[PDB]
Amino acid sequence: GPLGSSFFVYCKGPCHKVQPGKLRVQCGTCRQATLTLAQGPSCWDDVLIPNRMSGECQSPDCPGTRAEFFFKCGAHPTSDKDTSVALNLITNNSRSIPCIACTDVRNPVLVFQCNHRHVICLDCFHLYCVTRLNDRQFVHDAQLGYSLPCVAGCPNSLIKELHHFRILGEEQYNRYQQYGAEECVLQMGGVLCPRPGCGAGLLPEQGQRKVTCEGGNGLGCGFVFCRDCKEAYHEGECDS
């Protein structure tokens, strides 16, 4: 909910891990750090939602007023626009709440946005993300995307800032992105090409049972098949 110096970002290098973050702000128009804020931010929505706060750009040729917040890693000097995504669900365990998985008081921890605000440590959250990813247990929402709910199974606890899944590690994160793109195609009514090695994302018309893997140069393998059996194209008797 509220804010503070307990910011945590994911540094993609040289840290390749979750690190304490620095909150910065730039003018929403000229994209320069010359905008002053008459009041500081009070909640996460103030820094996560665009045009949620106003200020005044101190440039003589810029009347910008929109505050644009961003984050940088705080474990080492960073360039002026070397940003890192902020993990708003990760904060310091000031209440010293034990992990709901390993039953160990750790710091920092991730707090799900369920009704009970369940607490999990980063190590357990990493294992929780990997196992559900390999088991294809991730959930896809047309509004949020490819995410996971609370580890305890609470409703309406899907993680909204999908960059929290950077804890999967570099290899498993690109697999997560790939699985999300695949489930996204299936969500739009499309179908994945059954020919191994191709794995294309095809979006044919809803009525056509004919699927012509075809996009252009290297965009399709040219295999014609049926949406239902996914074996080979036919005119009838979809059974084996």
Binding site: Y176, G180, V185, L192, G199, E205
Partner: protein, 74 residues
Amino acid sequence: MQIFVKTLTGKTITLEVEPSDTIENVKAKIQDKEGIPPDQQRLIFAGKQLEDGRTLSDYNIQKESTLHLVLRLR
């Protein structure tokens, strides 16, 4: 900055973009290098379809992060 656009088949493309660039601008850069008309392009990041009016910073897409491209030929 640089971002990557990958198809589900495995083909990868590199683009020179800015965080303020819109998804519509991203699809235009794709056409300038691949000849794919933007109307047939559907960009996906972390399983979420990217709206043409939105920007990369709206999705917090960082440098050298990967966008997924699926074609819609209707």
